[PDB]
Short mmCIF file of C-alpha atoms in Angstrom, two decimals:
data_model
loop_
_atom_site.label_atom_id
_atom_site.label_comp_id
_atom_site.label_asym_id
_atom_site.label_seq_id
_atom_site.Cartn_x
_atom_site.Cartn_y
_atom_site.Cartn_z
CA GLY M 1 -84.82 -83.79 127.16
CA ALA M 2 -87.40 -86.03 129.47
CA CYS M 3 -90.16 -83.73 130.64
CA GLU M 4 -93.50 -84.68 131.07
CA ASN M 5 -96.34 -83.93 133.48
CA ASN M 6 -97.59 -85.81 136.26
CA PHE M 7 -100.93 -84.52 135.53
CA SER M 8 -102.87 -83.23 132.50
CA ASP M 9 -101.14 -80.17 130.32
CA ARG M 10 -104.92 -78.23 131.23
CA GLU M 11 -104.05 -78.34 134.85
CA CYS M 12 -100.16 -77.99 134.83
CA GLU M 13 -101.66 -74.93 132.11
CA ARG M 14 -103.41 -73.36 135.43
CA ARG M 15 -100.34 -73.00 137.40
CA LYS M 16 -97.76 -72.41 135.52
CA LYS M 17 -98.17 -69.00 136.65
CA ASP M 18 -95.56 -68.30 139.86
CA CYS M 19 -94.05 -71.92 138.83
CA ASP M 20 -90.54 -71.38 140.30
CA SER M 21 -92.59 -70.26 143.65
CA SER M 22 -95.35 -73.24 144.17
CA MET M 23 -93.45 -76.22 145.18
CA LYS M 24 -96.58 -77.68 145.27
CA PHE M 25 -95.94 -77.45 141.43
CA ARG M 26 -93.34 -79.27 141.23
CA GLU M 27 -94.60 -81.39 143.36
CA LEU M 28 -97.06 -82.82 140.72
CA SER M 29 -94.56 -82.91 137.98
CA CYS M 30 -95.19 -81.07 135.79
CA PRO M 31 -92.09 -79.96 134.24
CA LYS M 32 -93.63 -78.82 130.63
CA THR M 33 -95.83 -75.75 130.08
CA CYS M 34 -93.87 -73.81 132.62
CA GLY M 35 -90.59 -74.82 131.37
CA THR M 36 -88.63 -76.16 134.02
CA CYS M 37 -86.41 -79.38 133.94
#
């Protein structure tokens, strides 16, 4: 349990889709919203 977004949840929410294929999304460090930890 260490899922914390480096960006604001509002912004991570915009990229909540294609998170599986968006490598930059992972680099944005938004494990929440996508549910990927």
